[PDB]
């Protein structure tokens, strides 16, 4: 356990539609090198395949809506959604990509 | 484009040996975008295991390497993994993925379906 | 003994605070006994020729007072560099310095399929604009999503007449990677940024659809008849990027004579573009087949598509 | 009791601040052991100084003279971004003056500034306007962001999940 | 000979900081000499004489006079308009200055919609709207002033207040138009007036001028494909006309044909200095089984005697 | 558009009478805009005389008011100026113009050639 | 009498082609009304009809180069020209348009 451990906050949330909802995962040490944060964002679909959400901690892969917003600084990093949709119930993850081996958070599932 | 076929879930005794496979549907893997194996323990954490790219440059996890190896066949477009000397805690869900490069850092477009290994 | 008194005055901003195109920097050296006096100026430390400034030493008995004006343009002050009028007097050194009391846009080219299919020479240009210059590094990074070691690109500059500098760069490409859609990332850096900018694209997505290409003819007018105009249509394809061209008698027809339209999508989710071309008299007396050819990806077999349409 | 000059706490990189705890040790019989991240300090006086701050010196901070009553874990916020609301105090008691201001990178010229009650565009003005709420009340908590005109481009600053303590 | 006045002023340092005192030496030269009384004006009123420290340097007949004033820093940073004002031989020779700050203290944006010839030559009932953007929702009201150049009485306009989704407020206003006054080019102006305003933003317009030119028209249909035997398309050609505002319309079987089915291209010039624009519209099956006369029609000013040229078409 | 033909200039005698004219090419002058007589003493200032609008509302220069009359004919689409009791100072150059208004404040964009009338 | 007495400044001038020149009509009272002064500036070429140059002292006439600039408020009212051409060297005028009768200057002629 000599590497950076990843702690998400909160763990799971019951919600409703259209809500402006937010999560935060935390690291131990800061690796923000060259003005770059080497973090990525992930979603498994429960019973099915995983999915990258955001690469390079700010950039979305092609094929998503725009209702989603990741941010933060240092070891504190934070993802936000402005409006809930019926398709939004899954399990969600963040992950670092600077110093190998690459570490993971505990995971986050959303309820209603 | 590219499509993925994992293979090899089952029940094997601890401290034994087995082999894996990971079938590629749509690209001659010899030319770029690293070829990788992934663990996830269900109900628990996640694991990048190892990483081998097209020129044959390998990387492993230091806590795990010393008992497991990885093989390759790009003409059959299929690469594999022989496992050895496993304990009870290696019961997990196991994934296969495809590296994509960015500035010395790598990522997957591709996620497996995940196969279940259950070892006592 | 008295040491000299050095101060600096300048031109003036008016009753609305506007801009003379030339600024006058009057470096005064007052209150000193005469002796050994030689004066210089240092623009960022660097000196220029001795014919940009003017001085009139006023000597009042045992005292003296030197004035010294330097005239430059406004744009040197808008260049925001530092000027240092300096006098040598008895070894004891006194001086003063004065300077003046941004954005960064970039683009990316998408070349023609002629340069891909027929000229067959892919060299991608990455485009940076609004280079308001500094003194530090502009360290650029042409880079690849596959990350194989790259070849070398272009590097040029130009001071634009609205003031600004620029840099773009052009890197050669292979063809088949783009045929397979490899993605790349030109990337400049600068120290003054709180954060930097990345940019990338590649060959487009989706399925593929071929178009319905046609072209027809015009009638004449009672006014004049020797100068007519033909035009080209296309419709209902995917994707959109197409070299369109113009063929007659093994001659690349001149570009500025024909006008083309913009790619708009059809209401039935395909795309459609049109064009236009004037004709004149004596060429139909020569020959009649003038080929509006084009290059769609799904065109067959060599991405070849035209209708040889003529007159009569 | 930490007396922070300036009482603003969230900063960019490479910046300077005055760090001063208790004024009851005004005559200072015992010196002050400051605790970056728990780690014991070296400052002779009871005032600590930062010039041109580092990211890695941030985070949890405490001090003490020699009494069991140790100071509070104070947390620090070094940044490098484009848009920043800027605050003095979050855990605010009732009836207190509240301080509200937004900040631009390297303190530059931003216009057309809307303050946001939790999504609702509560107060616009053409430029910056340091908002005061001189007395706290019940319905004041929330999560408040900012918007403006940056080099003609337009972004949105972070929203801050403000909590009110109610006595 | 009359003098000319120029101002030479203090410099911010290498750090760009203002000096705490400001030395205002106005240089005055170039006059057949006489009596000289310089007054200083802060915002137009005569400043005190004691802080004016003048100097009269004269070289033969050339007199390079110079009058120093001394402020503090925020005296200048009060953004007041300061002035060196010489009176020469009974005349007055004056130079002004003011604190030079940044720019653009508003930049309000508004719009105006000159109507369609359809509402001039077909419907012939024009209503013009002037359309203000970026309105601050506040307390003090606006005072709108629709206005003319001919000075003749007006009808009643509109006023459309709405708080905007992105936070601001919106007001536009609409007025009906007479016909021939625009045909003879009458000029109109709606005017803002608000308590926030140190200025006022006004825009005016009339009929756009130039020479006159009549166009040339064709239209062409779709020779069918083996795939589609019922669904075809039309398109209509125009060229060489001036000035270039058109209502374009579509006629078939005494039906003003609908809109979102069709589309229409943009005003683009020709090398022979006319313009050329196109449009398009699909074909369906049963309509030609009903009737076959179709007109892409358009409304040009130099079209005559009914401001239109029409071309009925048929199949094959 | 409107074109101007001044008519009625030359040598005149003092303390008498003179009817002016200025011919308009291209308007019905009863419609709108003011119709104006403007004078220029050569080597000296600029002298507005009088004005009549389309309805016939009428203003004079008060310095000259009491001496001069302005007439009109909109069927002829020409307006005139019957000036009486001439003076020695009336040697001047005479420009007819049309009024163009904005908020009750008027302007004359157009200018004739201007006709010198010299009293002798 | 009580007319706002104009003071054009200067009386006349000689220049070269390309000179950035500035000129003021000076008044006595303020016609700033609703934040607006009612003032136009003029010019007549020698042996020709006059020509209005800018209406309301802020709004151009059509068909001009943009190298000119008017200004001023209260009783001070100012025109600035940035680049001089030979066809500009003539006599120029200005006039108030606020309270009737409307008054006039002496005209300032520029030479080359
Ligand atoms: C000083 O004058 C310079 C001389 O023109 C100008 O520099 C210009 O910078 C602009 C910045 O937008 C650039 O203009 C175009 O930039 C790209 C390139 O597209 C076209 O440029 C080619 C040559 O540069 C042409 O051969 C082709 O027509 C090509 O298509 C475009 O992306 C821009 O369009 C728009 O880009 C974004 C995307 O929508 C818009 O948001 C912008 O508003 C912009 O309009 C421009 O077409 C270009 O580098 C250069 N101008 C040209 C044509 O050479 C510039 O006007 C001025 N600069 C400053 C700082 O004042
Ligand atoms: C809050 O949201 C508002 C939504 O109402 C924003 O209003 C929008 O403002 C922009 C800029 O003012 C408008 O863009 C164009 O404005 C007019 C209107 O164009 C058309 O608007 C409607 C479509 O939205 C149509 O239904 C109308 O028929 C109308 O034709 C155009 O005239 C402008 O053109 C101007 O700029 C072009 C270049 O782009 C120039 O070539 C022209 O000369 C001209 O100067 C703009 O293109 C936008 O349409 C408008 N939305 C409306 C009215 O529906 C508002 O900006 C936003 N506020 C903030 C602070 O974010
Ligand atoms: C802003 O974020 C704060 C987090 O600091 C939120 O305040 C928290 O609200 C939750 C909701 O109950 C509480 O946290 C937990 O409460 C349970 C029982 O109430 C308790 O057993 C846990 O120990 C924990 O405290 C608590 O009231 C409060 N947490 C703290 C420590 O402040 C708040 O929801 C967010 N929103 C706003 C607008 O304030
Ligand atoms: C913070 O860093 C230094 C230290 O204050 C500032 O730079 C200057 O340092 C010299 C050294 O004596 C002094 O003139 C001043 O202490 C500083 N000048 C100013 C203007 O403060 C630097 O500017 C400060 N900037 C920040 C907030 O990062
Ligand atoms: C200090 O914080 C760092 C995070 O960078 C952490 O790894 C370490 O455990 C902390 N402890 C020390 C050394 O004070
Ligand atoms: C990959 O390419 C090599 C080299 O041509 C070839 O021998 C091999 O059969 C190819 N494999 C696949 C799966 O296409
Ligand atoms: C101008 O209008 C008057 C008013 O009736 C009329 O008598 C005259 O004939 C008109 N002239 C022209 C040229 O229309």
How does this structure look, described?
The complex is a heteroheptamer, with 2 copies of chain A (112 residues), 2 copies of chain B (120 residues), 2 copies of chain C and 1 copy of chain D (167 residues). Chain B has 120 residues and is mainly beta. Chain B has no helices and 12 strands. Chain C is mainly β and 312 residues long. Chain C has 4 helices and 22 strands. Chain C has helices at residues 74-78, 113-118, 176-179, 282-286; strands at residues 5-10, 22-32, 37-43, 53-60, 63-73, 83-89, 94-95, 106-108, 123-131, 143-144, 156-157, 165-172, 184-185, 214-216, 229-235, 243-244, 247-248, 251-252, 258-260, 264-265, 271-278, 294-295. In chain C, strands 14, 15, 19, 20 and 21 form a 5-stranded antiparallel beta sheet that branches. In chain C, strands 1-2-5-4 form a 4-stranded antiparallel beta sheet. A 4-stranded antiparallel beta sheet of chain C has the order 8-9-12-11, with no helix packed on it. In chain C, strand 6 (83-89) and strand 7 form a beta hairpin. With 167 residues, chain D is mostly beta strands. Chain D contains no helices and 14 strands. Chain D has strands at residues 10-12, 17-20, 35-36, 39-40, 47-50, 61-62, 77-79, 83-87, 98-104, 111-117, 120-125, 131-133, 142-149, 156-162. Chain D has a 4-stranded antiparallel beta sheet with strand order 11-10-13-14, with no helix packed on it. In chain D, strand 10 (111-117) and strand 11 (120-125) form a beta hairpin. The radius of gyration of chain D is 18 Å and the shape is globular. The relative contact order of chain D is 0.17. Chains in contact: A-B, A-C, A-D, B-C, C-D, C-E, D-E, E-F, E-G, F-G. Strand 1 (5-10) of chain C pairs antiparallel with strand 1 (4-10) of chain E, so a sheet runs across the interface. A molecule of 3 linked components (NAG-NAG-BMA) is lined by residues 141-143, 161, 163 of chain D.
Describe the SSE topology.
The complex is a heteroheptamer, with two copies of chain A (112 residues), two copies of chain B (120 residues), two copies of chain C and one copy of chain D (167 residues).
Chain A: E1 7-9, E2 12-14, E3 21-26, E4 39-44, E5 50-55, E6 59-60, E7 68-73, E8 76-81, E9 91-96, E10 108-111
Parallel strand pairs in A: 2-10
Antiparallel strand pairs in A: 1-3, 3-8, 4-5, 4-9, 5-6, 7-8, 9-10
Chain B: E1 3-7, E2 17-19, E3 21-25, E4 35-40, E5 46-52, E6 58-59, E7 71-73, E8 78-80, E9 82-84, E10 92-102, E11 105-108, E12 115-117
Antiparallel strand pairs in B: 1-3, 2-9, 3-8, 4-5, 4-10, 5-6, 7-8, 10-11, 10-12
Chain C: E1 5-10, E2 22-32, E3 37-43, E4 53-60, E5 63-73, H1 74-78, E6 83-89, E7 94-95, E8 106-108, H2 113-118, E9 123-131, E10 143-144, E11 156-157, E12 165-172, H3 176-179, E13 184-185, E14 214-216, E15 229-235, E16 243-244, E17 247-248, E18 251-252, E19 258-260, E20 264-265, E21 271-278, H4 282-286, E22 294-295
Antiparallel strand pairs in C: 1-2, 2-5, 3-6, 4-5, 6-7, 8-9, 9-12, 10-13, 11-12, 14-15, 15-21, 16-22, 17-18, 19-21, 20-21
């Amino acid at each position: 356990g000599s590497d950076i451990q990843l702690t998400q906050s909160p763990s799971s949330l019951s919600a409703s539609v259209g809500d402006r909802v937010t999560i935060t995962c935390r690291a131990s040490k800061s690796v923000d090198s060259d003005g770059d944060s080497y973090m990525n964002w992930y979603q498994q679909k429960p019973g099915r395949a995983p999915k990258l959400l955001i690469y390079a901690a700010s950039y979305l892969e092609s094929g998503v809506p725009s209702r989603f917003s990741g941010s933060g600084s240092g070891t504190h990093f934070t993802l936000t959604i402005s409006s809930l949709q019926p398709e939004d119930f899954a399990t969600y993850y963040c992950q670092q990509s600077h110093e190998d081996p690459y570490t993971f958070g505990q995971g986050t599932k959303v309820e209603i | 484009e590219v499509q993925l076929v994992e293979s090899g879930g089952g029940l094997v005794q601890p401290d034994g040996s087995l082999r894996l496979s990971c079938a590629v549907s749509g690209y001659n893997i010899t030319s770029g975008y690293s070829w990788n194996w992934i663990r996830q323990t269900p109900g628990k954490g996640l694991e990048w295991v190892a990483s081998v790219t097209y020129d044959g440059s390998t990387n492993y996890n230091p806590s795990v390497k010393g008992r497991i190896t990885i093989s390759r066949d790009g003409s059959k477009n299929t690469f594999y993994l022989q496992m050895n000397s496993l304990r009870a805690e290696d019961t997990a869900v196991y994934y296969c993925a495809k590296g994509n490069n960015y500035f010395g850092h790598w990522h997957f477009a591709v996620w497996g379906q995940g196969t279940l290994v259950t070892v006592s | 003994f008295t040491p000299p008194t050095v101060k600096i005055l300048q031109s003036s901003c008016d009753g609305g605070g506007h801009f003379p195109p030339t600024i006058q920097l009057l470096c005064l050296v007052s209150g000193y006994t005469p002796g050994t006096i030689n004066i210089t100026w240092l623009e960022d430390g660097q000196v220029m020729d001795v014919d940009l400034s003017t001085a009139s030493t006023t000597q009042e008995g045992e005292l003296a007072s030197t004035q010294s004006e330097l005239t430059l343009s406004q744009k040197h002050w808008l260049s925001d560099r530092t000027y240092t009028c300096q006098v040598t007097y008895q070894g004891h050194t006194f001086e003063d310095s004065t300077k003046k009391c941004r954005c960064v846009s970039a683009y990316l080219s998408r070349p023609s399929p002629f340069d891909l299919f027929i000229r067959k020479s892919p060299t991608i240009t990455c485009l940076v604009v609004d280079l308001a210059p500094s003194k530090g590094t502009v360290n650029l990074t042409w880079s690849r999503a596959s990350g194989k070691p790259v070849n070398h690109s272009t590097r040029k500059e130009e001071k634009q007449r609205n003031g600004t500098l620029t840099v773009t760069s052009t890197l050669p490409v292979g063809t088949r990677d783009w045929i397979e859609g490899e993605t790349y990332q030109c990337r400049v850096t600068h120290p003054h940024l709180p954060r930097a900018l990345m940019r990338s694209t590649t060959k487009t997505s989706g399925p593929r659809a071929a178009p319905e290409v046609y072209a027809f003819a015009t009638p004449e007018w009672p006014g004049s008849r020797d100068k007519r105009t033909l035009a080209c249509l296309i419709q209902n394809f995917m994707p959109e990027d197409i070299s369109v061209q113009w063929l007659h008698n093994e001659v690349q027809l001149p570009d500025a004579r024909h006008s083309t339209t913009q790619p708009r999508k059809t209401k039935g989710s395909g795309f459609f573009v049109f064009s236009r071309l004037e004709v004149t008299r004596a060429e139909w007396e020569q020959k009649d087949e003038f080929i509006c050819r084009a290059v769609h990806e799904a065109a067959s077999p060599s991405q070849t598509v035209q209708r040889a349409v003529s007159v009569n | 009791k930490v007396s922070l000059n300036p009482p603003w706490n969230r900063i960019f990189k490479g910046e300077n601040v005055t760090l001063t705890c208790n004024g009851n040790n005004f005559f200072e019989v015992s010196s002050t052991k400051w605790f970056h991240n728990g780690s014991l300090s070296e400052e002779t006086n009871s005032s600590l100084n930062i010039v041109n701050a580092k990211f890695e010196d941030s985070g949890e901070y405490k001090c003490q003279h020699q009494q069991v009553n140790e100071s509070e874990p104070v947390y620090l916020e070094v940044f490098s971004d484009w848009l920043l609301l800027q605050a003095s105090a979050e855990v605010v008691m009732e009836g207190q003056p509240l301080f509200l201001r937004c900040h631009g990178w390297r303190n530059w010229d931003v216009y057309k500034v809307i303050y946001y009650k939790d999504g609702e565009a509560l107060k616009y003005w053409y430029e910056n306007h340091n908002i005061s709420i001189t007395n706290a009340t019940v319905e004041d908590s929330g999560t408040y962001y900012c918007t403006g005109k940056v080099c003609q481009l337009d972004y949105e600053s972070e929203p801050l999940n403000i909590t009110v303590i109610k006595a």
